[PDB]
């Protein structure tokens, strides 16, 4: 559908994207502990950003649409799980900074959320559905800690946030404007996963 | 009731009661209030909830997080709908009336104030918005006990568990604020708009915001 007609509009970035090293090293089981554990303070950060974003969106939105994404998004263990194993505490995630990446990418989704809902959600989508990808790739793993991260977003829970994303997105009528804002969202998920890599400065 | 809900209460005055005691919701009680400003009310209430809402969500994005998330749970969780369903068939309320039907004045500028404190910061809306939520609670408490079964009905989702335990997360949200008389006066405010809302309802006034 719409999500279909956003990906084509990307080329080549959409699998540098959700077939970047980062995901084929949690595939194979060869990425370093250090740089996951990186990753996932980092990813800690843009969740809670990511979050807020989506509050002040949600606001400007159809209100079928918005209640059906609250209901599942604010419903009610892995990350708790990895985060003990990997000795990463709330206190580790908050007083961390953000590498440059990082507050780019929540700072996009800041911008667009303070606009308009459809710009927004088509901001929001490529992390949203490329995480459900990825998921269902990195289950796999010989890994226990990358089956267990893999494993939030290859369950039936994350599948049917999707779906109520992806029937909010099937309403907006896709312009060029909207596919730039989508292609800008996968060229920092590229990024993000560089960052992670390189496990840049978190001076942010 | 202690700490910062019993100050701001305390603050308001005589306000206080003319809200929770209104005529309107003595009406309820006795059940002598007719249906049709009922209705009227119901109406209004269905395009005041709305607006709540959407300000809740864009206050929510600046307050502590864990804060937010206990009360965001509990307010996007799967009887408010179930009730207000049973209610908006008896009364024979659709959505589209909801929609179709305007604001009467107070309607409006009620919702306006919480936009706009919604748009600034989340304790000024927190204050705001705690009058609607908590007079609600106490006001299901006695309306509970009417012979009417409307009113009953209506009051029963109110004096729900569910529905203390959302107060109890507000007031747990609330008790981060430090007050001061400014947020007193939003508070105030927001009492104003509960007295004129019942007010206006059983005048039936003009829906042509």
Same mark, same amino acid.
């Given at each position: ?70 209901? /599942? !998004? ?11 194993? /990997? ?27 303070? /606009? ?49 994303? /992806?029937?909010?997105?099937?309403? !907006? ?32």
């Amino acid at each position: 559908g719409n999500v279909e007609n956003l990906i084509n509009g990307v080329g080549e970035l959409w699998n540098k994207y959700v077939k970047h090293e980062f995901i084929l090293k949690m595939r194979d089981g060869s990425l370093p502990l250090d740089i996951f554990r990186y990753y996932l303070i980092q990813d800690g950060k843009y969740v809670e950003d990511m979050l807020r974003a989506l509050l002040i969106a949600s606001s400007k939105g159809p209100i079928d649409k918005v209640t059906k994404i609250l209901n /599942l !998004v604010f419903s009610s263990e892995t990350h708790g799980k990895l985060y003990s194993k /990997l000795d990463i505490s709330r206190d580790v995630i908050v007083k961390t900074g953000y590498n440059l990446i990082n507050y780019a990418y929540t700072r996009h989704l800041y911008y667009y959320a303070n /606009l308009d809902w459809n710009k927004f959600l088509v901001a929001w989508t490529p992390c949203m559905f490329g995480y459900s990808i990825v998921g269902d790739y990195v289950i796999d793993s010989p890994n226990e800690v990358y089956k267990t991260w893999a494993s939030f977003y290859a369950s039936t829970e994350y599948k049917k946030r999707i779906e109520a994303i /992806l029937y909010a997105l099937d309403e !907006v009528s896709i312009t060029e404007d909207l596919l730039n804002i989508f292609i800008n969202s996968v060229r920092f998920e590229i990024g993000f996963w560089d960052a992670s890599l390189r496990k840049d400065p978190t001076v942010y």
